[PDB]
Amino acid sequence: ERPDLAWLDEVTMTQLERNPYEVYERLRAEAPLAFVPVLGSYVASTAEVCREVATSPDFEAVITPAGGRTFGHPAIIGVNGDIHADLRSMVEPALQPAEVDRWIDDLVRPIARRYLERFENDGHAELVAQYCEPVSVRSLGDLLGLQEVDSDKLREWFAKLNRSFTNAAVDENGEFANPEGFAEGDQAKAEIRAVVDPLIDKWIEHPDDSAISHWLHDGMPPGQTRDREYIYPTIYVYLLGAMQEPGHGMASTLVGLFSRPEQLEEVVDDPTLIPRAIAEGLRWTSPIWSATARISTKPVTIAGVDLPAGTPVMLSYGSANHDTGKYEAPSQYDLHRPPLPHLAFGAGNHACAGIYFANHVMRIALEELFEAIPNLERDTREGVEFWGWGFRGPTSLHVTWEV
Ligand code: HEM
Ligand SMILES: COc1ccccc1O
């Protein structure tokens, strides 16, 4: 209904999945808060608007429509008040920095070595499938208590959940355009239940050091546990983004480094630059690109738009992280950018709970990769395609090295 934005009626879901940055460049200039018809929602595209909405007292969390169809209730990302406080209290212990520092090295480093050992003498690899994804999922899976679930299965689950969660397209009547696209998310959930229900049965009676056992038991009266239906949606939140994103982020960081060969060389020579390299990678291609949202709780005016109460706004943090109000030439990867604030972990009460853990997973993985293969090069015969609007990352990363 905004006349000057009639061009947005012609934006497609496929276009946004393939490459959302041209449309979002226009949005940041034309309408930092804009209703995108194919998404069925207002979208926040700039750093100022995303930060304002994420931190405003007049907004609260809401799950996106496709996210809710995928995860149900109470997903930690979609709830507020006492339920959110309890779910944050449940997930935070293992994520506390002092706690992560106690065990993160002995968790991730042997995992990274195990996956490297499989290919480090080959002279070629596709790092998304052979390294970045397995290390990310094996690390978190072991932390959670899912040691027995193979990395290939954790990877399949996150991919199916991604596609269902981001199945956001709506038709001319505001109805989901592709209802069949939720079926694979439902199938993943059914598989997850079949594996995890017996584990929860065991943990209720026999608590252990796994994170999910602690989710059941922590803070509960004697002999009581949180109901499994109450915790499953947050398990699904983990089995999508927490499993997927460290792998996404380390792979994007590698693509960015390969794009600046002098910078790759600096980081291989001086691995203390790895954290900076990662932070720039997350800004450059944000793993959680436009997955979350907030909803107004009263009438508000944001970026000149008067919103009624009850209005959802999607937080396109991956666009915010290319805001030219903040960054020069944001589509260029540059290790030597000054260490400015970014929105790849969101903001406010619903900001990422796992930042410290995620940063260490990616750091340790990259350290081990460069120690193992110091002469790592991108295989320039192959293209790198990035995919995703809700969650974004490279679909492959072919590399080569002299053996
Ligand atoms: C590089 C990897 C990661 C990125 C880029 C990422 C980014 C994000 C973003 C953007 C959000 C939404 C914040 C908002 O709406 O303002 C989020 C939420 C979340 N993150 Fe992460 N994160 C990643 C890894 C993880 C990991 C590994 C875990 C768990 C161990 C995790 C746990 C969560 C939780 C629990 C939430 C929901 C917080 C809430 O709604 O209260 N994160 N993260
Ligand atoms: C940490 O996992 C998520 C974050 C935001 C949206 C969906 C997720 O699975």
Numbering used by the authors: 5 to 407
Provide the authors' original text about this structure:
As reported in a companion study, we isolated a cytochrome P450-reductase gene pair, gcoAB, from Amycolatopsis sp. ATCC 39116 (encoding proteins with accession numbers WP_020419855.1 and WP_020419854.1). Unlike other known tetrahydrofolate- or non-heme iron-dependent demethylases, which are fairly substrate specific, the P450-reductase pair characterized here (GcoAB) demethylates diverse aromatic substrates, potentially providing an important advantage in both natural and biotechnological contexts. GcoA and GcoB operate as a multi-domain complex; guaiacol is processed exclusively in GcoA, with electrons supplied by the GcoB redox machinery. While the organization of P450 systems is diverse, the architecture of this 2-protein system, combining a catalytic P450 with a 2Fe-2S ferredoxin domain in addition to FAD and NAD binding sites, represents a new class.
The X-ray crystal structures of GcoA (in complex with guaiacol) and GcoB were determined to resolutions of 1.4 Å and 1.7 Å, respectively. The GcoA structure reveals a typical P450 single-domain architecture with a central heme adjacent to a buried active site, captured with the substrate access loop in the closed position. GcoA possesses a broadly hydrophobic pocket with the two oxygen atoms of the substrate coordinated by backbone carbonyl and amide nitrogen groups from residues Val241 and Gly245, respectively. A series of hydrophobic amino acids is responsible for positioning the aromatic ring, including a triad of phenylalanine residues lining the active site cavity. Close examination of the GcoA-guaiacol active site shows that substrate binding involves interactions between the peptide backbone and the substrate hydroxyl (ring C1) and methoxy groups (C2). The ring C3 position has a relatively close (3.8 Å) interaction with the porphyrin-γ-meso carbon that bridges the propionate-substituted pyrrole rings. Demethylation of guaiacol, which binds tightly to GcoA (KD = 6 nM) was then monitored over time via NADH disappearance at 340 nm under steady-state conditions. In contrast, the free energy profile associated with the opening-closing motion of either GcoA:guaiacol or GcoA:catechol exhibits only one minimum, associated with the closed state, suggesting that the enzyme will close when the substrate or product is bound. The same simulations also suggest that the active site constrains the binding mode of guaiacol, so that the methoxy group points toward and the hydroxyl group is oriented away from the heme iron. This may forestall the lower-energy cyclization reaction pathway predicted for guaiacol by DFT calculations.
